[PDB]
């Protein structure tokens, strides 16, 4: 038995940060060796008990995620930061115990004309608590006149779209992110390593 790592790392759909999928890898063995023997991950920041030597570690729950973020903002995923994506769309806990694996996908998720099919929220008037999915296509108003079901004066749609083009350098380029978060619960350990 092998964990479905390939599905989470070699899929093609993924989703924007405003409504991000979550996968519960459990009751399987994950070959972590291939994670750090590929020379293809731009960032491999593990904050867990052991960024290397994940052998002899067994847990009762593995949480996998998948995000698409603009290049320069990838570093905002880590805990203790503050910014648009980090505070309004995804926030790690102070005692996070997993890994953040971010790679470049500029050769798959960008079109010459422009792929305006990626979104991120811009405001919530409430700082997000520990990571919690937030899907809401609201028409939040800004006073003045009522927003009668249309994005009119002082009416601001809360889902900005990324400016993805295959011309910008590292800064404004797509990155695919995986917040591979561990969670040791009271239940018996299931996901034992190699």
């Amino acid at each position, epitope marked *: 038995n092998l964990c479905p790592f390939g599905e989470v790392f070699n899929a093609t759909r993924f989703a924007s940060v405003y409504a991000w999928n979550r996968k519960r890898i459990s009751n399987c063995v994950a070959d972590y060796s291939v994670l750090y023997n590929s020379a293809s991950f731009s960032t491999f920041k593990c904050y867990g008990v052991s960024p290397t030597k994940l052998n002899d570690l067994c847990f009762t729950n593995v949480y996998a995620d998948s995000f698409v973020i603009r290049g320069d903002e990838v570093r905002q995923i880590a805990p203790g930061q503050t910014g648009k994506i980090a505070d309004y769309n995804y926030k790690l806990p102070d005692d996070f115990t997993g890994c953040v694996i971010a790679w470049n996908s500029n050769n798959l998720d960008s079109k010459v004309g422009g792929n*305006y099919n990626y979104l991120y929220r*811009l405001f919530r008037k409430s700082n997000l608590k520990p990571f919690e999915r937030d899907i809401s296509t609201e028409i939040y108003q800004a*006073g003045s006149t009522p927003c009668n079901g249309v994005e009119g004066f002082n009416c601001y749609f*809360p889902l*900005q779209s*990324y400016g993805f083009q295959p011309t910008n350098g590292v800064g404004y380029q797509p990155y695919r992110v995986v917040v591979l978060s561990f969670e040791l619960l009271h239940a018996p350990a299931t996901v034992c390593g190699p």
Partner: antibody, heavy 120, light 112 residues
């Protein structure tokens, strides 16, 4: 970098039909609000148009209703102002401008070099 | 129907030092549950298009030095430039966007 450019305008007979084009890129028109603003030589500055992302809001001004319209193509990433039944009080330096998003307000931050229109 | 008035029509302030602009609106611009004012201040040199100075009536727009500062109550607004440099003379504009029909008050030509 991100800059706004304009095309069209010039000379026309009284009551003609004009199509002024404002084009730009680098900041994803899909998620910004654009406007047209008048600049009449040696009179002042005014506001005569409004649009939104999906063309939901078409707010006009006082001397606009029934004679101006605003449209925009996001595929080609530009907007067009169609201008019918002109009068000499319409002649001016027309400016295309952008919104601000949640930050700033509905204000104007990036302004194109503008165009000129006059009946004669 | 927001008829706007401004006092310094083509202001000329001692050829230097500071400069003061006063801008008032008939209907109050603030909002009940905002405590913020929806009026903005614009710069415009002759020729080139107008540029941002103040948004939300109290904040210095990023991209300009800290000389300029616009303040005022919920209905009255004033400028403070302090030092009148040799590359700042240009017309100043008010924008009133509390209502669906924003209107631009008028031009004040700050020069010499």
């Amino acid at each position: 970098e991100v800059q706004l450019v304009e095309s069209g305008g010039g000379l026309v007979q009284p009551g003609g039909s004009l199509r002024l084009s404002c084009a730009a890129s680098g900041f994803t028109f899909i998620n910004y609000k654009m406007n047209w603003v008048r600049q009449a030589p040696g009179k002042g500055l005014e506001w005569v148009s409004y649009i939104s992302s999906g063309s939901d809001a078409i707010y006009y001004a006082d001397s606009v209703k029934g004679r101006f319209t605003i449209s925009r193509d996001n595929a080609k990433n530009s907007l067009y102002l169609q201008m019918n039944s002109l009068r000499d009080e319409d002649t001016a330096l027309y400016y295309c401008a952008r919104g601000g998003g949640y930050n700033y307000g509905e204000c104007m931050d990036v302004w194109g070099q503008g165009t000129t229109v006059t009946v004669s | 129907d927001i008829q706007m008035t401004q006092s310094p029509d083509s202001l000329a302030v001692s050829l230097g030092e500071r400069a003061t602009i006063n801008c008032k609106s008939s209907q109050s611009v603030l909002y009940s549950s905002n405590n913020k004012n929806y009026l903005a201040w614009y710069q415009q040199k002759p020729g080139q298009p107008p540029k941002l100075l103040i948004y939300w009536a109290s904040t210095r727009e990023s991209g300009v030095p800290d000389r300029f500062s616009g303040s005022g109550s919920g209905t009255d607004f004033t400028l403070t430039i302090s030092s009148l440099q040799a590359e700042d003379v240009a017309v100043y504009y008010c924008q009133h966007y509390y209502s669906p029909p924003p209107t631009f008050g008028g031009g004040t030509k700050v020069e010499i």
